[PDB]
Design a protein around this ligand. Sequence first.
Ligand code: HEM
Ligand code: HEM
Ligand code: HEM
Ligand SMILES: COc1c(O)c(C)c(C/C=C(\C)CC/C=C(\C)CC/C=C(/C)CC/C=C(\C)CC/C=C(\C)CCC=C(C)C)c(O)c1OC
Ligand SMILES: C/C=C(C)/C=C/C=C/C(OC)[C@@H](C)[C@H](OC)[C@@H](C)CCc1oc2c(O)c(OC)cc(OC)c2c(=O)c1C
Ligand SMILES: CCCCCCCCCCCO[C@@H]1O[C@H](CO)[C@@H](O[C@H]2O[C@H](CO)[C@@H](O)[C@H](O)[C@H]2O)[C@H](O)[C@H]1O
Lengths: 246, 93, 74, 55, 385
Amino acid sequence: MTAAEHGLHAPAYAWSHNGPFETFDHASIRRGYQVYREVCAACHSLDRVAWRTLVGVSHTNEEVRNMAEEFEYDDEPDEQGNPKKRPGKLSDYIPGPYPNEQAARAANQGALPPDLSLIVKARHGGCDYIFSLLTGYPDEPPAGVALPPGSNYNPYFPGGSIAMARVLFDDMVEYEDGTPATTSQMAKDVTTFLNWCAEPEHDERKRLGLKTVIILSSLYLLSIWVKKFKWAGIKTRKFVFNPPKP
Amino acid sequence: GPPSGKTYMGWWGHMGGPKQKGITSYAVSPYAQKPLQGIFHNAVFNSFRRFKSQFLYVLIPAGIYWYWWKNGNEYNEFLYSKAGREELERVNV
Amino acid sequence: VTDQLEDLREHFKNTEEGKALVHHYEECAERVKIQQQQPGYADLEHKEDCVEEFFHLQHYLDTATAPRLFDKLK
Amino acid sequence: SSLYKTFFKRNAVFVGTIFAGAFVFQTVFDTAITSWYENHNKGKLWKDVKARIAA
Amino acid sequence: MAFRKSNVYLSLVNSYIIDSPQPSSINYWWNMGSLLGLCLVIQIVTGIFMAMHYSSNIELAFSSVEHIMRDVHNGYILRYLHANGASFFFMVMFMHMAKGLYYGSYRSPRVTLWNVGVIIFTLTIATAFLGYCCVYGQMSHWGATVITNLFSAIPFVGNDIVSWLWGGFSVSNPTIQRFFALHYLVPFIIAAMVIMHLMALHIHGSSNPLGITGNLDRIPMHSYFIFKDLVTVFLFMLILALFVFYSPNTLGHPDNYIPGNPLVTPASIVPEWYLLPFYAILRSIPDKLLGVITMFAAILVLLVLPFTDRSVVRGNTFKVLSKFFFFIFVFNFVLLGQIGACHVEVPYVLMGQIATFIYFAYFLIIVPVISTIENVLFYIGRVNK
Ligand code: HEM
Ligand code: HEM
Ligand code: HEM
Ligand SMILES: COc1c(O)c(C)c(C/C=C(\C)CC/C=C(\C)CC/C=C(/C)CC/C=C(\C)CC/C=C(\C)CCC=C(C)C)c(O)c1OC
Ligand SMILES: C/C=C(C)/C=C/C=C/C(OC)[C@@H](C)[C@H](OC)[C@@H](C)CCc1oc2c(O)c(OC)cc(OC)c2c(=O)c1C
Ligand SMILES: CCCCCCCCCCCO[C@@H]1O[C@H](CO)[C@@H](O[C@H]2O[C@H](CO)[C@@H](O)[C@H](O)[C@H]2O)[C@H](O)[C@H]1O
């Protein structure tokens, strides 16, 4: 199939979480959330992430509570039956920008911004892909490419024509920790944050794997030894034949 | 119990093999044997032998298939590049 | 500050290999605009683009920038 | 190895001792691994990030 | 006599696992069977614990699996064990089958043993498909759609069977709920078939790498093979662990992390890896009916081997031509799989059609011709008249 239709192969960046012994970089997760809140959240929902999961990961119990309360959620009807709202709590899920699919398409030229809760696992290339896509918008499409109205060119997206325009620009966000908010830095951060959204068990999973693999390896080496011992009599057994006389 | 059909395997004492005579076997307790460490110097050069006789039966058919795969793949890559769009229209439909 | 990726890309577009690649892409771009200005471009069903040449450029840049970009990031 | 004959004296280790040693192992092993793991990832953990924060 | 022999329940255990006379020379290739029983257990245990948190309604299925992944303590371990375990179950089954093929295990007096094995294989494939649909991701919906449609190829009543299987106009709620119910059931039927498989195995015992009688030198299952099985059980667990903890999604498809959409079939749709060779076979026939017939025949043709193997000796250990063509068959099978993972494009389409031919030719032409030639070669190389 043509290279354009396949899409450009995303290269391998040196993510700090790559490697069997590596945990996520939680500061990057913290920053990634800000980028999501200030840029992405305007078009992208994050339905599968509950406020409480942020606590102890990227924010404090207090910080998350304040963030949740900034949003209103449907509450149980009053004594008389009329509906009523309520500020958000930790048990709630991060709210999305649109009330339904139809409203989301209307605000994006008929396109549907996917939920990003699993985006890292729902694409070949994972982090490398997401990052490359965000930082791979050329100022102008390659010569000869007839780009449809309302579309944008990105070599990493299959078919090259994507409905999402470049949204990351240098210093469009003021990092709380003072870090220079360059486009590649912001992309590196949201992507790390999105990987955590999709794989919240990451750090703990690799820790358990370490113990599991050590125990099993030992058990394996040990069983070999035990087997050889239990078989030594059979392996070294010797036969002699003396043809019986008639 | 109910009558059982004849098979080609019995049990200890009546395995179904031919009558053995003249064969004498010897063995030594694993306890009296040299603890697992001797499987080297004496059992190392001897090993790897049971794949020196077999590797050709595996390698040749493997080679034939890897080459056939590589060839078809590289040809597909050519067909979908600029240089081969002419040949593509020819061999396609 | 200036974007770290844009920096490394610009830097590599100016190496011997990078210049050679932009040249081939450039030679393609030139050949394309000349075909557009000629009569009957709308109905040709054989319009050439420079995605391929562009991909070779981008691939080279990716191969050189990818293993270095993060040492410059926080 | 005479080190074995001091504790178990030519006899195999019995289930009770095996079970007892297993409960001990579980605790020790877990702490040893968690320690190494958290140390290997110093700077990236939330514990480390919270130290650089004050609110 | 010893209690293990006198007690009604223990004697079964004794005759099958303790005193069972094994041929002294069986190699590690004979360890796959126990590994298959272990796989069956891992799938059943992990599935029951997950079932406790799963909702089959088409509106909740995908989220209920995300709930298992995020909210259930150790939930991701259960799901990743189940998913990766299914793949490991197939890797081991192919090896178990390949071992049988190579050593002439399908031969008399083990024909029944082999036939029951073919049934288990079909049931296992059906069970995995049903499970895959339960996730209700994009690959789930289209897999369910494509596979239930296989039956539409049946003349006259085919479309009726499909609407009946679906429980409606298309793959919907009724479909996913019945597929979960069926996914829970089949593993137990497989368990019953495994017992019938072991019963046939018991009357004649295992074969061995030499292909000759094992009656002159047997050693008890207990101790020797129990501990020898332990060696591969741990190696199997170690490798499964590497995937479950370090690379849990490498054997899956990213599209299944997207909820199923009845209006869009991803351009990236690809069947599960263990189904690729069969998929390629079907794709190679440019006809609907013949495509599905040929694919099913690719499985049933395994039943023909006891009759087309004309050799007078069991197994390929001492057969130069048979060993060579066996490996042609194995690598041809891997090619079929690699073709299945490729686009329906020029070089690939023809390669798939030739590989498909080679697949069937092996059982129907190569084996009978080659085994006959080898029979004759063995004779004239020693008879001096
Ligand atoms: C840094 C913040 C953002 C991130 C991380 C992000 C990420 C993504 C990703 C990964 C996709 C999926 C592409 C694919 O299918 O492979 C996507 C699609 C999309 N995004 Fe965003 N996005 C961001 C901001 C925005 C904003 C602010 C908007 C709305 C103006 C937007 C609109 C869309 C649309 C319309 C699509 C659909 C693409 C298509 O179907 O062609 N995104 N985004
Ligand atoms: C040999 C038996 C079995 C096999 C081969 C098997 C295979 C599978 C497969 C391939 C999947 C999809 C994996 C994925 O998420 O990608 C699945 C899902 C599932 N299976 Fe099974 N299964 C077996 C037995 C069972 C049993 C007995 C139960 C008991 C209820 C069960 C319950 C489930 C559930 C709840 C799911 C959905 C969760 C999930 O996606 O993992 N399975 N199964
Ligand atoms: C869940 C699936 C299965 C289980 C639990 C199972 C289990 C076993 C066990 C325990 C053995 C004895 C040890 C060994 O030779 O590995 C055996 C032997 C055998 N099985 Fe299976 N099996 C399964 C599937 C199959 C399939 C799919 C086939 C073939 C299509 C098959 C064909 C055979 C044959 C022919 C033998 C005799 C091998 C010999 O002695 O040479 N089995 N199986
Ligand atoms: C002559 O050749 C032989 C040979 O004969 C034998 C027997 C073996 C040894 C191997 C085996 C016997 C394998 C046998 C395996 C099986 C029969 C598996 C059957 C499968 C099952 C799934 C069993 C059923 C299980 C359950 C009901 C339990 C699951 C549920 C649970 C625990 C409940 C969970 C719920 C709560 C609330 C706690 C050989 O290796 C061999 O060749 C060397
Ligand atoms: C109640 C139970 C019912 C109705 C059905 C059970 C029985 C059916 C089977 O065998 C038992 C069946 C699995 C078949 O066996 C021949 C397999 C080899 C299937 C091979 C298979 O897979 C695909 C797949 O997975 C897909 O996913 C995304 C997509 C697919 O198209 C693109 C296919 C496909 O085109 C084929 C042929
Ligand atoms: C499946 C779940 C896994 C559960 C745990 C696995 C099983 C662990 C069993 C641990 C110890 O089990 C233990 O085995 C040793 C033999 O090795 C037994 O020893 C017995 O045999 C040894 C060896 O001939 C003798 O020296 C010894 O005097 C005798 O008592 C011991 O009495 C028993 O208690």
